[model samples]
Target: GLVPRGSHMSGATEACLPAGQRKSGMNINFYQYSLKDSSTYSNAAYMAYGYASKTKLGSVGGQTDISIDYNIPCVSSSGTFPCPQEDSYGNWGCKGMGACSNSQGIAYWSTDLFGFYTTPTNVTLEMTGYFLPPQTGSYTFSFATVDDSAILSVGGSIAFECCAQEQPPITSTNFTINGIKPWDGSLPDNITGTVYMYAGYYYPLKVVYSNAVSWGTLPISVELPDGTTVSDNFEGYVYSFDDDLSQSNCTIPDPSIH
Candidate 1:
């Protein structure tokens, strides 16, 4: 799996391109991560740990529900606590009756000997995965813009799409769909599908808001190994930052074009 930073930028017109436009290849299956010492990790860890602590086994073919209690106190001052209460805009603020006062700490915290170093404010963790083509065929994928931005890919092709550089309480945007065609080049048959999504604050705002953003992918339905049909959903951590932040233009320098 690949973890690419600067996938989203503020004041930037375009960042990620579509898959058909980029070099050809296969996308990875899974990408997972945890925030350094923020409550974000607590929630993710709790969810994962709860799944692992389960007793009764559930049908592998069907879905299972797992619950975790991230409200537990941190092991030490260097450890992370569960994300505090969130605002309507998704901004996370400290909560509780103890040290968890109205404080904004770095997204990461260092437990190394040199005293705890508050991690950067805008730290983020992401997970990505792909589904192989059941059969080579043409498929169309799309995304609806929200407060942040997003990217999409199929068969290792990159579809460049980004959302407005703002928060909720704002109107959403729509990504234009170029078209649909064969992924493998062999008459569109038995081709698999994959997608990657990233989100972050622009530049100036990055310095302020350090919370991770939340987003969900468009619904994708495909034919299953069994004649019965199945559908998949893309829901996971996007990116987070303060509203005061902005993004610097970090597009890869293209020498050949000039």
Candidate 2:
């Protein structure tokens, strides 16, 4: 369920006004499914989901800064891992074992690539997208969790980090910046990032799960010619999957026919 504005989960904001009146900021919601218990087939099966949508930020005319308040919940025995780390050239590459385990036994991870933009103020981007492991060979999974690895990166750099592997029920971290720059042939333009995960059984009759959630908030405070300020907000979701082709059905049928 989504929490409406003026509610406790709305975070810090200006005073409320009458309906139809413009609010200072915008509100967005994101959600994903999980299969931790054996109740529903949808939840019990492993899958990946996310989104990649674009929005335009009009002319700023003056310096502007952007920030976001984000949250992601993972409901499974597997935890979250980090997005792939990038080199100076802006190319992203996978890293680490990419697995996690939480306290509630719900494994998950999330990130907020918050920053500022200085040039090319008016821009359109592919925004955020999600990727699930392919149903093939061994699958790799990575994401942020309370205790395990909670890592994030911006512009080919690592922004946040915590204990690589830990239990669950962890506090959330914040990512903030003073300014942002348009892609200057130095790095990939736009707030681009990716998640790396792997999954496979280490023992008998065990199924490994891996997944991720990607999103952002808008309404960045931009200075205007009239000395006034304005802002906007945006959000999206996506998921991917990887499966092994070598595995085949080995169960025998009932002997009633015999």
Best by lDDT: 1
lDDT of each: 0.23, 0.20
TM-scores for all candidates?
0.24, 0.17
lDDT of 1 by residue, 23-129 (tens): 12111111122233233222322222221232321111111111111122222244455442231122333343334332342233332101223222222211122
Model 1 stretches with alpha carbons more than 4 Å out: 1-80, 84-99, 110-130, 135-149, 155-258
- Worst lDDT window (10 residues) for model 2? 200-209
Per residue, candidate 2 scores C-alpha lDDT tens digits across 78-173 of: 444333213111122223432223232233332232232311111111121111122212221212111110122211011111111111111222
Candidate 1 local distance difference test against the native: 0.23
